[model samples]
Target: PTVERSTRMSNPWKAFMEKYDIERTHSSGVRVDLGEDAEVENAKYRIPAGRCPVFGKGIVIENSDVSFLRPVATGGFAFPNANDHISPMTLANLKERYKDNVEMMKLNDIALCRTHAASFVSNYRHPAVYDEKEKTCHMLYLSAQENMYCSDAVFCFKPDKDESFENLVYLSKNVRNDWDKKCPRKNLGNAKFGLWVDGNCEEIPYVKEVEAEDLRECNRIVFGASASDQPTFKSKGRGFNWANFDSVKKKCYIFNTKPTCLINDKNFIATTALSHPQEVDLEFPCSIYKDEIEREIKKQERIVLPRIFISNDKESIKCPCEPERISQSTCNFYVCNCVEKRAEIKENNQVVIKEEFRDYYE
Candidate 1:
């Protein structure tokens, strides 16, 4: 209820469009059309600046949202033309001006692929670009950690039939050392992450570094790196409320970090908090059930390939057909016992079993 009301309040133009049946389909091209004459007035009326839609298991980081003015090139909080401080009125104006296209800036169809443990140092913003050739959407955001390293996380997703996104994954980064140079892409290495599509998840791989530029050109880079933790600004440990000017003066400040080189041509800035996780920090209980579920899946094919092992004391095993002896005696025996059926080994050392036939293995 709160989210719906907030959405309506934040993007009043959206409410206006709905009331007037001014439907604007999301596209890679123009977002709306008010004709040429209305362009001047409506041009200033853009949709609201989108915020990250919070859902799922990611814990919000306090004090991570509000930031001092920093340059995008250097991964700072201030955006170009926004000055030393970003004001609500300034944001409102920016939204009104880009109202038609503000929806493009928001991640409409997002799913938490993986969650890291931190939040973004600055709010995530991107004029997401769509690649018609690749049928993909690309975005960038900044994440910073105090005294630790920061990351410029890059993301790309393919749109589904319903216009939702899938195949979301992070672009790879360098491992030997964190970024110290002016060029971020140069600092970032080959993609080591892979995407989890449908219900299947891929294993994170070792440092098999592919060329960073080569990976960037590809439509999908399979780096199984961790996803970013969600950011919050509730004035808690990791949260920063930038709405408070006094707090900014005391807690936040700006820095001149190294300038970054564009990868495929656009400048990049990322927060250390928004950086994809290097490893899983949360323990999942479902992993414990995975083996049991997998076993159930293979129940029908249990004995399709019999378990085989050579006995160290071969002399004690007088059975002529060793494979058959092991299968019928040990494998089938255990299977029958497990299923509450009957089986036995006769005096001839030939295993005798009595049960409805089913694939079974010891």
Candidate 2:
């Protein structure tokens, strides 16, 4: 694929690590584990430089696979049945399920936990110190939109790097804004984007080109706050070569002007796009199908807890009383149903219901 590869720019990762007296040895490049602990001070349990990862949906701002990590601080979950609003201990547990390099980053900035280790992990659990060597697979924390929308990620392995898949390719959810900014983690003015191999920046490229955004307007939709005629994301408003880069909806604002009009907001850059919808943007059929597939995958991963406890001597080996399925009730009925099941479940035990569908679904 290389008619002529670029003459290998300087390795930005090396530059970043060397600047802070940190060692760099990855054959591919150094990985960054970002969090609120980052972009702050270089205390005993904090990362050096990091930033929030967010951008308008449908925009592919970064694409690379040189490093892997578990995040320190990820975006917040919602409230009162909110998506991910839990303590650091709970979030860290979830992180362990994905990436081993996950660190307990300080979440003190948010109005929640008020403790020390919760503010930051003890020095012993630092990922940078533990992930000194490569492992079978890499897991990392990534910023995601919404309290509950799990962010997507990707993986890339060179042709020689593995026997199964060939030619290193970055992996992650193909949806835009998956890993927006926080790239070129070093000084962009002095170096190019990507990981560092030896003294040079690695060839790990962006998953999609900057031009892809304009070409793949897959999630483009009129924000409900602006226009009323909802173009079901696949309408050929513009050629696939260029997306209609509307700028109105980028910022959270109230206005009477059209979606194309722009007002200067001091807080951040404002794009001309109309307001994004409150729910997931599934205007295009692709998003619709992806959502459906993901839902099924999630359902299959559902877990059930065991309700009965057997005594050590067989004096209390009783079957748990199963609750009646809410076959005709509203969605709200499942909350009480789950509580009833939990009441009878033994600690650390599991059980699975054989019903074809969940009670809420029925």
Please state every model's RMSD to the true fold in angstroms.
Answer: 24.5, 27.2
- Over all chains combined, what TM-score does candidate 2 have? 0.17
Worst 10 residues of 2 by lDDT: 21-30
* TM values, all candidates: 0.18, 0.17
Choose the strongest candidate by lDDT. Answer: 2
- Which regions of candidate 2 are displaced past 4 Å? 1-362
> What global local distance difference test value does model 1 have?
0.20
Tens-place lDDT digits, model 2, residues 1-362: 11221122222233223322211111111122112132324553332121111112211223433222222333111111213333223333434543543232422111111121122332222111111112111122332211211243633211111211111112121111212221211111111122222211122222222211221131132111221111221111111110122223231222221111111112222221211111122111112212322343354323321221211112121223433332322211111121222111122222222244235433
For each candidate, what is the lDDT?
A: 0.20, 0.21
lDDT of 1 by residue, 153-212 (tens): 432121111111111222111111111111111111211111121111112122222222
Which candidate comes out best when scored by TM-score? 1
